[PDB]
């Protein structure tokens, strides 16, 4: 609270790149989580053998 300053105006470019890749990963992660969800049973079987 003391020194955060409430201001985050600059990406710094390199940070923006890594984060964008990460945001893209989040989108892919969402659909992997969603397909795993729709095929609940098949993924369960993998876990039992695991």
CA neighbor of 35 nearest in space, from 23, 25, 46, 43: 43
Contacts by 32-40 with C-beta closer than 8 Å and gap 24+? none
In degrees, rounded to 5, the angle at the alpha carbon of residue 42 between the alpha carbons of residues 38 and 47 is: 120
- Core vs surface per residue 7-30: b (16+ CB within 10 A) or e: eeeeeeeeeeeeeeeeeeeeeeee
Q: Structure resolution in Å?
A: 3.2
Dist CA 21 CA 16 (whole Å):
9
CB atoms within 10 A of CB 4: 7
Q: What are the start-end ranges of the E strands in the chain?
A: none
Experimental approach taken: cryo-EM
Cα–Cα distance between 26 and 2 in angstroms, integer? 31
Q: Give the DSSP H/E element, type plus range, for residue 48.
A: helix 40-49
Of 25, 6, 22, 3, nearest to 14 (Cα)? 22
């Amino acid at each position: 609270a003391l020194f955060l300053t409430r201001n985050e105006s600059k990406p710094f470019y390199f940070i923006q790149k890594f984060n964008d890749f990460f945001d893209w990963s989040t989108s892919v992660f969402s659909s992997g989580v969603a397909y795993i969800l729709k095929r609940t049973i098949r993924f369960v079987l993998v876990f039992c053998i695991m």
